[PDB]
Amino acid sequence: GYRVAGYETQ
């Protein structure tokens, strides 16, 4: 398996 994530203003 794997994991992934993201974040951004607006």
Side-chain angles (χ1 to χ4, degrees), residues 1-9:
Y2 69 95
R3 58 194 189 278
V4 60
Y7 175 108
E8 193 173 326
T9 294

